[PDB]
Amino acid sequence: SQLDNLAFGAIQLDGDGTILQYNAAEGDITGRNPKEVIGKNFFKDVAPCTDSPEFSGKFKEGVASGNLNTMFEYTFDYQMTPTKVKVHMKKALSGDSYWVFVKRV
Ligand SMILES: *C(=O)/C=C/c1ccc(O)cc1
Ligand SMILES: *C(=O)/C=C/c1ccc(O)cc1
């Protein structure tokens, strides 16, 4: 069914980093209101601590090459309590979009 039925955070991005979908579990981790963040740039506005070579830089390399499927640990710490997460970022398996899935670790 739903994006909002997943127990882990899920964000859909276009290749500019624009937020297309943002689920309730992700908001619960980060304190963001899903409705508020849709349409903003993930890397530059919502989540500036991800604007780093290993996160946004890896994303942009994958958009360019059309190849992206990586998992890594990260700490989210902008306008929230520092929170360790595991991130799975990938090019979608159909169409032309990208996903960032997140769980607490
Ligand atoms: C660093 O600035 C991380 C912030 C953040 C990560 C993930 C989100 O869904 C929202 C903000
Ligand atoms: C993308 O890398 C998808 C991975 C995935 C989807 C659902 C599963 O049960 C297992 C892997």
| Domain locations along the chain | 1-105
Q: Which of 90, 99, 101 to mutate to test the pocket of ligand 2 (most atoms within 8 A of CB)?
A: 90
Q: Which fold has domain 1-105?
A: Beta-Lactamase (3.30.450)
- Strands (E) across 2-97 are located at 9-13, 19-22, 69-76, 83-91
In the numeric block, which tokens belong to residue 81? 């309590």
| Ligand 1 center from residue 95 Cα (angstroms) | 25
The experimental technique used to determine this model is X-ray
Ligand 1 atom closest to the Cα of residue 80 is: 4
- Return the number of other C-beta atoms located less than 10 Å from residue 42's C-beta: 25
Could you tell me the strand order of the sheet in which 98-104 lies? 19-22, 9-13, 98-104, 83-91, 69-76
Ligand sitting nearest the alpha carbon of 44:
1
What's the count of helices (H) and strands (E) in the chain, helices before strands? Answer: 3, 5
| Ligand 2 center from residue 8 Cα (angstroms) | 13
